[PDB]
Design a protein around this ligand. Structure first.
Ligand SMILES: *[C@@H]1O[C@H](CO)[C@@H](O[C@@H]2O[C@H](CO)[C@@H](O[C@@H]3O[C@H](CO)[C@@H](O)[C@H](O)[C@@H]3O)[C@H](O)[C@H]2NC(C)=O)[C@H](O)[C@H]1NC(C)=O
Ligand SMILES: *[C@@H]1O[C@H](CO)[C@@H](O)[C@H](O)[C@H]1NC(C)=O
Lengths: 174, 48
């Protein structure tokens, strides 16, 4: 994990999250549960599916072995044909293995950024209102309803109004 | 016995002439359809 989002900050996955890939866990007065944001997991689905097709699409043109026979008096040509056919297979099996090996690393690293950037925007929206615990948890100050959690979920967090109540909560703990 | 073969194009003639050690052809092979096929080597049998 180069970006460090997987493990690092958040080292524990959510088994209860089956709706999508990336989501938010809310623990407020109005119960608790798991919810998903579509704009993040849909792009990952489209990107990965495009990658999967790209491996198949690019590998459409490949060497196709064909049978040739010789009459026991021309063995230099038979050896030449044998070394050419398996030589091309050796070249093509290396490209397929190398392509699979590299694209496996891409998908794991691509997923790192998406959850990392998902964390980055939530920190960038909450900012002073919440505190950073270390495992991805944010503890905000205002005593709003569950709709504010949805407001965080649609990426529409208006700052000013919530600042005054939070700054009254930054001065009572100080 | 050393057997030979050749391809006879349409509207073409092949002339045989010998006075011994000759093996005259009996049936000739038409080439109706030309496509793609392979002569594979295997000991398997038909599987329906
Ligand atoms: C195998 O037999 C065929 C047909 O029996 C031979 O075809 C020959 O083809 C030539 C060229 O078309 C013909 O010449 C022309 O014939 C027409 C009609 O007779 C005439 O009006 C023209 O002025 C011109 O002479 C030739 O007649 C024809 N042979 C025939 C019909 O017996 C073919 O040549 C034979 N294969 C070999 C290797 O000879
Ligand atoms: C979700 O975000 C969009 C962003 O334009 C907003 O229009 C919508 O009101 C949000 N959902 C709720 C329940 O406020």
């Amino acid at each position: 994990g180069l970006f460090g989002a997987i493990a690092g900050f958040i080292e524990g996955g959510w088994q209860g999250m089956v709706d999508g890939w990336y989501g938010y866990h809310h623990s407020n007065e109005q119960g608790s549960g798991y919810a998903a944001d579509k704009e993040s997991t849909q792009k990952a689905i489209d990107g990965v599916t495009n990658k999967v097709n790209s491996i198949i699409d690019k590998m459409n043109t490949q060497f196709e072995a064909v049978g040739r026979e010789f009459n026991n008096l021309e063995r230099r040509i038979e050896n030449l044909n044998k070394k050419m056919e398996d030589g091309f297979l050796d070249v093509w099996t290396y490209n397929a293995e190398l392509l699979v090996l590299m694209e496996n690393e891409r998908t794991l690293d691509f997923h790192d950024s998406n959850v990392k950037n998902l964390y980055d925007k939530v920190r960038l929206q909450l900012r002073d209102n919440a505190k950073e615990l270390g495992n991805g948890c944010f503890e905000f100050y205002h005593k709003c309803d569950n709709e504010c959690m949805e407001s965080v979920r649609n990426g529409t967090y208006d700052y000013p109004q919530y600042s005054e109540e939070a700054r009254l909560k930054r001065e009572e703990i100080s | 016995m050393e057997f030979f073969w050749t391809i006879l194009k349409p509207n073409d003639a092949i002339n045989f002439e010998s006075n011994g050690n000759f093996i005259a052809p009996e049936y000739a092979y038409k080439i109706v359809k030309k496509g793609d096929s392979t002569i594979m080597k295997s000991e398997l049998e038909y599987g329906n």
